[PDB]
Amino acid sequence: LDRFSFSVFLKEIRLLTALALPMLLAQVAQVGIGFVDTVMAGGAGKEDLAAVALGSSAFATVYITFMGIMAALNPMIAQLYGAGKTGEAGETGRQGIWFGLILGIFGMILMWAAITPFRNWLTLSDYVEGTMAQYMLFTSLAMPAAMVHRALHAYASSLNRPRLIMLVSFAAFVLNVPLNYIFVYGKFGMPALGGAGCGVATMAVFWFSALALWIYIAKEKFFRPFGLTAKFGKPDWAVFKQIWKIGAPIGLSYFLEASAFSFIVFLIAPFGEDYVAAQQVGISLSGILYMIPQSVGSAGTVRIGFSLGRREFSRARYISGVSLVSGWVLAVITVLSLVLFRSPLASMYNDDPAVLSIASTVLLFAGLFQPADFTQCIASYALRGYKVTKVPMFIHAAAFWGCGLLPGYLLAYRFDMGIYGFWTALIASLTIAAVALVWCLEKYSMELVKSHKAVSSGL
């Protein structure tokens, strides 16, 4: 009853030599995707009533939510590069690629369903409707979710020394800018529909990168066993059903930021119009560079589960630490450039036009949760990341919302200028992650004593 978190400090000998440095280009190819968006927010402002993101940010829900499930193979195919047949690893790769294409056709059917924001109960920016050529960024850019899932299931097999995806999903955006605008209004192309056509453009480019999967059975020995991506073996053939309970527990736990969605956009909903809807200029600049952050362990999740098959038990989960606290360097040594700087005259009118004439009650939380979160899932992208640990690392987050509930109507009901005041037990819901998580990561690096059941050998 002082530290039921066992031996926390120790994750250390001479580890300074821990190189998950290619596990950055894993998430710099991801800024390579991150950054098309603006090349068609500010590429399809050519249409002014195309604020069009009004879909492509409630499409990208049943992306990043399913996207979860799929990125749940990150371990699977690293942990079996402790074994040898990336064709048994691959027969998953396929079984999944069947998933990322099967659940991609619910992405692509729950999308069909989707199209009835013909609905109302609260205010503008989020209800009204009249002319909706979103109507089409719906279908035209919802009709992808299959190939766009396989085209992630790709890097769900870049979990073993290649980032030949910083290669493609860079010269994939470069493919798209050019294209993008042709459809919004263009050349010989189908040059009409633009309040969507930015997106039919976009998604063409998912099926483009979709096969820089195919086209990287190329640099070395295979990851192609695309024999019939079939299943049947029991009632339902796992290596698929087995992927299920690494899947459920993630998207449904990617339904963290899936409610930091109708929390962040329901406190511009009272009389806090002006600079509380310039909250989202900061909390977009949260995600924009929270990404190379966060996703380092959502890249280091390799180095750890890979080195479990390769039986270096905790000789990787005690690099869990020296990866935990390595971006954790910048986790705080650039929360400095977050509570400090703002939108200056370097900010123009981009990702959401609101720059000149609003307050800095926006960098108040660019510290509250910002580093006290930063790592507090690049923990979990090294929990699940390592083990199966998402089974109730799902219920990791039933508290990162069910503990950030009243700190929802506690900016409303306030004691001060509490704009970061419903960022209360939503930077304290979110700093009880300091616990249960990196708790099960000394309940957990303390399980590879149990499993390291012969301390050493001879000579």
Partner 1 sequence: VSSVPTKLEVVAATPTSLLISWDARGEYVVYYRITYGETGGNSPVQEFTVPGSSSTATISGLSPGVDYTITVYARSYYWGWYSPISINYRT
Q: Which residues bind ligand ET (CB under 6 A)?
A: 37, 41, 51, 53-54, 57, 125, 261, 284, 287, 351-352
Give which of partner 1, ligand ET, none residue 352 binds (C-beta under 5 to 8 Å, depending on kind): ligand ET
Closest CA to 166 of 317, 21, 383: 21
Select from ligand ET, partner 1, none the partner in contact with residue 453, using the beta carbon and a kind-dependent cut-off of 5 to 8 Å: partner 1
Q: Are 350 and 311 in contact (CB under 8 A)?
A: no
Judged by beta carbon, residue 128 or residue 406, the one nearer ligand ET is 128
Give the contact letters, 398-437, x = binds to partner 1 (CB under 8 A), - = no: ----------------------------------------
- Picked from ligand ET, partner 1, none, the partner binding residue 291 (CB below 5 to 8 A depending on kind) is none
Phi/psi of residue 393, each to 5°?
-90, 5
306 lines the binding site for partner 1 (CB under 8 A): no
Question: With binding defined as CB under 8 A, does residue 443 bind partner 1?
Answer: no
Nearest distance, CB of residue 455 and partner 1, angstroms: 7
Separation CA 302–CA 18 (nearest Å): 13
Site residues (CB under 8 A) for partner 1, limited to 108-167: none
Q: Which does 287 bind (CB under 5 to 8 A by kind): partner 1, ligand ET, none?
A: ligand ET
297 neighbors 75 (Cβ within 8 angstroms): no
Task: Answer for the pair 99, 244: CB distance below 8 angstroms, yes or no.
Answer: no
Q: Does 449 participate in binding partner 1 (rule CB under 8 A)?
A: no
Cβ distance to ligand ET smaller for residue 257 or 442 = 257
CA distance 378 to 298: 6
Cβ proximity of 132 and 178 under 8 Å: no
Name 351's Cβ contacts closer than 8 Å, sequence gap at least 6.
37, 38, 41, 42, 281, 284, 288
Looking up tokens 């590879």 gives 448
User: What's the closest the beta carbon of residue 385 comes to partner 1, in angstroms?
Assistant: 20
Please say which residue, 178 or 287, places its beta carbon nearer to ligand ET.
Answer: 287
Instruction: Give the separation between CA 238 and CA 227, rounded to whole angstroms.
Output: 17
- Smallest distance, partner 1 to C-beta of residue 450, A: 7
- Least distance in angstroms from the C-beta of 57 to ligand ET: 3
Tell me the site size for partner 1, rule CB under 8 A.
11
Min separation Cβ 442 and partner 1, Å: 20
**Cβ–Cβ under 8 Å, residues 381 and 298:** yes
| 307 contacts partner 1 (rule: CB under 8 A) | no
| Contact flag: residue 451 with partner 1 (CB under 8 A) | yes
Q: Are 111 and 341 in contact (CB under 8 A)?
A: no
User: By the 8 A CB rule, do 316 and 304 touch?
Assistant: yes
State the angle between helix axes of 173-184 and 197-210 in degrees (0 to 180), rounded to the nearest 10. Answer: 150
Distances in whole angstroms, Cα of residue 267 to Cα of each of 144, 354, 355? 32, 17, 19
457, 428 in Cβ contact below 8 A? no
- By a kind-dependent CB cut-off of 5 to 8 A, residue 458 interacts, out of ligand ET, partner 1, none, with partner 1
57 binds, among partner 1, ligand ET, none (CB under 5 to 8 A by kind): ligand ET
Structure token pair of residue 228: 């019939």
455 binds, among ligand ET, partner 1, none (CB under 5 to 8 A by kind): partner 1
Stretch that binds partner 1, among 142-150, 168-176, 427-435, 448-456 (CB under 8 A): 448-456
* Residue 221 interacting with partner 1 (CB under 8 A): no
Residue placing its CB nearer to partner 1 in the complex, 262 or 451: 451
Our CA dihedral for 195, 196, 202, 207, rounded to 10 degrees, sits at: -160
What residues make contact with partner 1 under the rule CB under 8 A? Answer: 311, 450-459
